[PDB]
Structures are given as structure tokens and as C-alpha cells.
């Protein structure tokens, strides 16, 4: 019944499950070194947040530089665990990698919405694609209220209102 400590806070991803990983240990927020970052290592971090399995594991903190101190280094893991700290660790707190080597992980569901035409990858009129489990798919036609379209246009940032073209 606590907020607890050491929760893998994912930020800069734009969703609930994406971006860099941050850990609040000994009262300090910190990133994770990318030394020998493994996809099997990315499986546990996704499971702890309840997101699911892992799709990609990215290094060099391309999601974003982490200002905080580096906490763990050279983490490898069996991939089947519930507590992140219980992963094969070369010690604690001491790192051979500096910042710009922070780790990033994409979990099972980081959904992205795009408006696509043949000419433009992102345009303001076209088809509706949804990102799920590292894949792109069309959206259903049946039972679309005017409010349903209204939200899609607002999220994509094209217009306040929108309309369905039959063509």
C-alpha cells in the first residue's frame, strides 16, 4: 500500500511504456548504463510496469540524455524475474560508462497514431494507422461517431473538427 521505491519510471517516450528508464534508489533518481544491454534484459523491465513483453532495447539514450547519476552498470539478467534489482549485476553504483550511455526500452504497447497518404508519410488527410506490438494496422470503419473523428483530428494536431470521407 505504498508508492514504494525503485519504481522504473519511464519518461520521454510519449506514452506509458517507452523511453528511458529511471530508478529511485537510496532516495535518488538515476538512469541505467547501456553496457551489454540485452533484449532478455528488456523483458523484465517491461513486465514490472505491467506493459508486457519487450520489442526493442536501445542504447546511448537516444530517447533522451539522463541528467541523474548512473546507478547500475553492465546489467545482464535471466529475463524471468519480478524485481529489477535481482538481475546479474557487476556490483552497484560504480560504472565504467558515462552519460550518453543511458538505456532505453520500448515495451509491448506503445501505441502511435498517424495520418498517412501515399505521397506524405504524415499528412492531414489519409488513412488511420495504429501502432501495437511493434506493428502498423488500419482502423475499423463501422460505428464511427462524429465525436470519434473529432478526437482523432485533435490528437494528430491537424484541425479542431474533421469529417469522414467515403472515398
Partner 1 sequence: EFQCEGHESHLSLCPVAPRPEGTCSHSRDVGVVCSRYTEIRLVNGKTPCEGRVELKTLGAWGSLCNSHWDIEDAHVLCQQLKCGVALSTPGGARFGKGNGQIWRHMFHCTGTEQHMGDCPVTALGASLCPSEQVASVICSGNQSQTLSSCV
Binding site for Ca ion (CB under 5 A): 35-36, 38, 41, 76, 96, 101
Kindly tell me which residue out of 16, 76, 90, 114 binds partner 1, with binding defined by CB under 8 A: 90
Supply the DSSP symbol for 9. E
Kindly tell me which residue out of 67, 96, 117, 148 binds partner 1, with binding defined by CB under 8 A: 96
Q: Is 16 in the site for partner 1 (CB under 8 A)?
A: no
Which element (helix H / strand E) includes 104?
Answer: strand 104-107
Nearer to partner 1, 10 or 87 (CB): 87
* CA torsion, ordered 32, 35, 36, 40, to nearest 10 deg: 10
Q: Which does 76 bind (CB under 5 to 8 A by kind): partner 1, Ca ion, none?
A: Ca ion
Cα–Cα distance for residue pair 107/167, rounded to 1 Å: 36
Cα–Cα distance for residue pair 163/167, rounded to 1 Å: 12
**Where do contacts with partner 1 occur on this chain (CB under 8 A)?**
90-91, 94, 96
Amino acid at each position: 500500500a505504498c508508492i514504494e521505491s525503485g519504481q522504473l519510471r519511464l519518461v520521454n517516450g510519449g506514452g506509458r511504456c517507452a523511453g528511458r528508464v529511471e530508478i529511485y534508489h537510496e532516495g535518488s533518481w538515476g538512469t541505467i548504463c547501456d553496457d551489454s544491454w540485452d533484449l532478455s534484459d528488456a523483458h523484465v523491465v517491461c513486465r514490472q510496469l505491467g506493459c508486457g513483453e519487450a520489442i526493442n532495447a536501445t542504447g546511448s539514450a537516444h530517447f533522451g540524455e539522463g541528467t541523474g547519476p548512473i546507478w547500475l552498470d553492465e546489467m545482464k539478467c535471466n529475463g524471468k524475474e519480478s524485481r529489477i534489482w535481482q538481475c546479474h549485476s557487476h556490483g552497484w553504483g560504480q560504472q565504467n560508462c558515462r552519460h550518453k550511455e543511458d538505456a532505453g526500452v520500448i515495451c509491448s504497447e506503445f501505441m502511435s497514431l498517424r495520418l498517412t497518404s501515399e505521397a506524405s508519410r504524415e499528412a492531414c488527410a489519409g488513412r488511420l494507422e495504429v501502432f501495437y506490438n511493434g506493428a502498423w494496422g488500419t482502423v475499423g470503419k463501422s460505428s464511427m461517431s462524429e465525436t470519434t473523428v473529432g478526437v482523432v483530428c485533435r490528437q494528430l494536431g491537424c484541425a479542431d473538427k474533421g469529417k469522414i470521407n467515403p472515398a
